[PDB]
Ligand binder design. Sequence first.
Ligand SMILES: [Zn+2]
Length: 256
Amino acid sequence: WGYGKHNGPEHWHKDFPIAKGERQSPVDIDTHTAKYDPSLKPLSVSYDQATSLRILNNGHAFNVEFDDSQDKAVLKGGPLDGTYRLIQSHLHMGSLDGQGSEHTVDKKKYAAELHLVHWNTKYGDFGKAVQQPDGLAVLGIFLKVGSAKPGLQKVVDVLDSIKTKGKSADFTNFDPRGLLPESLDYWTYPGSLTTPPLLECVTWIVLKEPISVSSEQVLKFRKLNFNGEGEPEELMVDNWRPAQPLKNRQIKASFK
Ligand SMILES: [Zn+2]
């Protein structure tokens, strides 16, 4: 599966029928219908002890793996019940500044969207968590082109080391705190993974405020390859799934 004409989003349902499920992601966040929820508790992002291990190219998107052997970096509060441990992060990138994000806000697309994946520790490990409706908590962060982002420059400098699929590079200083916007205002709704297996095990927390990255940083990420070494080049761009049917789910806002 991929994002091509012959293996893209419109084809996924054949191997993964849940693609046509009731709580699929991403979705368009319609601010005219999204509703403020006073029952939501304050969002708690504890990343001060976060510990990244490596960056990888799995042929689908730029990825970061984190040490989830302990509660070093966790997400709590908001719509969440319990503790969710950070395990990985990946980047969905567009081929043009006007596109790239999976979620949209009033149909508006951002240049890219970062996902920070966490699993509910009541389940023992990621593998078991992904099989439960409340197994994962994914924080979505929109990226727009503008001022460069320092917390991303160190990664951008070594992207050439993971240009093709199957490549990985040790990276112990990827601090997720440096990818967060100033405000933690967010929208939340029950959804799924946006790539096969497309399991509907995700509580989505999409931040309202995008972060800025420079055109140069964006360009570097767009130079990654979908293909493996020695294969015809296929730039890793537009690796995003379009908005899916809301199916009457309720999108809640953390702000009035
Ligand atoms: Zn994702």
